[PDB]
């Protein structure tokens, strides 16, 4: 059954504004590549690090911009944290 390749929930982190930003700009979804739109704010954190990070602890997270499915570093940071 074809659920599509862009319909999977995508990891996020939350900042001081309680507005979530996506982690990276791609992941595997239903056998395909699920990409965010170009320019979308993203955290330059790989999935394996995000999987392990201490939940609900403030980190200083590197900010980036999506370009062809990759979170390109913008050399800016903000506090963010992973939910329960």
């Amino acid at each position: 059954y074809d659920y599509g390749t862009d319909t999977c929930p995508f990891p996020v982190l939350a900042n001081k504004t309680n507005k979530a930003k996506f982690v990276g700009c791609h992941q595997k979804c239903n056998g395909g590549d699920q990409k965010l739109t170009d320019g979308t704010a993203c955290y330059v954190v790989e999935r394996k690090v995000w999987d392990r990070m201490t939940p609900m602890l403030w980190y200083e997270c590197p900010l980036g911009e999506c370009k062809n499915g990759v979170c390109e570093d913008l050399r800016k940071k903000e506090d963010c944290r992973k939910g329960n």
Binding site: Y3, D6, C8, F10, P11, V12, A20, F22, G83, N84
Partner: protein, 67 residues
Amino acid sequence: TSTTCCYRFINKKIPKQRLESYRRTSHCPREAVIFKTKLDKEICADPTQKWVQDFMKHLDKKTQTPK
């Protein structure tokens, strides 16, 4: 469960038989419904779509609510 957000919604109704449960999902840039299938796939769906609302009601009615 508050660690992911839906980016895009499924375009077509999911067959009712494949569904096991759902959760919701401001915080995220879009309010969303996430259906979980019996093969444990999680599928983002548009809460503004009538079929999404009907399916949530159906899954609510399938189990008795505890206590």
